[PDB]
Design a protein around this ligand. Sequence first.
Ligand SMILES: [Ca+2]
Length: 496
Amino acid sequence: SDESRLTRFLVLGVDGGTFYASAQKHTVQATDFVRELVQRDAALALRVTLDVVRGQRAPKADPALLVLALIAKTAPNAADRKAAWDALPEVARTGTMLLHFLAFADALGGWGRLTRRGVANVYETADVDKLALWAVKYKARDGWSQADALRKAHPKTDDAARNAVLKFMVDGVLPKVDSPALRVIEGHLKATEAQTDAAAAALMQEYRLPLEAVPTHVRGAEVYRAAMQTNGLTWLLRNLGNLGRVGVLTPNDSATVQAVIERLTDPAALKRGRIHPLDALKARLVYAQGQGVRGKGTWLPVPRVVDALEEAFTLAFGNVQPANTRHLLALDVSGSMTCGDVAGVPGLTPNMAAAAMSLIALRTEPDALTMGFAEQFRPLGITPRDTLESAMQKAQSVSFGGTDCAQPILWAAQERLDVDTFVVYTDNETWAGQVHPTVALDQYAQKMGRAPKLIVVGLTATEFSIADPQRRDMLDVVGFDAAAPNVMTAFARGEV
Ligand SMILES: [Ca+2]
């Protein structure tokens, strides 16, 4: 079905059953099916695309932006090209997304009337606050800048304030209406000219300015101190190291320490911020290193903060959106599972990641059973009562067998176990058995009267292929990242 095949491309960013959960290239490129579909039925291409954007299941806007460009620029009909343009303001939510859309479109046609108007409509529809934000935060994206687009599109609004910010976005010259939209602009201007951690701090204090506005050279204690009070939990999670470094968060400075602990374990803030347990696990591991990636400095991890992150992990389970399907999780339990940094997270071993995901399933899905490719294929005996640490150990066995992704499915049919979703967790070592998982899945359907799905996760994989591109019941997840769990859940629910 065109609808289903296009939706899959829109979510995964590929025209097959593979999610590159990444930190690699895999930039979305339009395949033949996608172009052919846009010519054949641009109207449904567009309806499908809006459905996906609104449904918000796509980890990335990229594929929807590309598809939208294709329709807008190359759809045979004028009503379709026009409808695509009319949707641009919705789909290109941020300044970056608009510049990204233009990078896709510029390879499909020049600046005809539809294009000038369509781009102009984006700026003319945005309020003075969104415009000001774009003016300071989304100035450029590689080749394309807001200035470029504005010179080609020439937007004009009814109100002088917005025209003033549009003018500023082109010529960088500061006016002075006010609408405190200019305020944030003036603030960002002065911020670039700081030289001192204190003036910078005093500046975002005066001007409600983001930590972004502060030159890397001057972001000291007062700058980070200031940033905390003005950001949510997600920010806080990825900034613990930056706080240990700039001398704000230290083992002998209890007031800030307690205040961080309270935010990290605030159930209401966890829920509203939609913190996934892996988000908390990543923050803990990153923070506990006391040293960052290239060119970062060091810091002294505060133990009780590390502790609070362990609590945030447990509390976050309550906010996971379940597939609501019966899962059988088959874990690779061999020694190499203890090696590697999944998703570039220092210390996040495939074994740790798989144990975390097992606990999640056990605690949130209608049913879940965990098996392992051990001496023989057997239950690991992990339960919702386990900790991350005890589950990790149950998922390690000195004697192991090949990681055969067909085998959990063959086993379940043999045991007449009702399973909706099979999930295999490995590092990068799928091993082919005598029966392919496709045959396995067919045999299960034939014996049990239901067609289940299979997800194979290569937690540190760069490339493998198990999922049949011609089937819909299979998904390969290559690598891992923060978007992977939601994609897997969406897939299991039949939405991908
Ligand atoms: Ca292995």
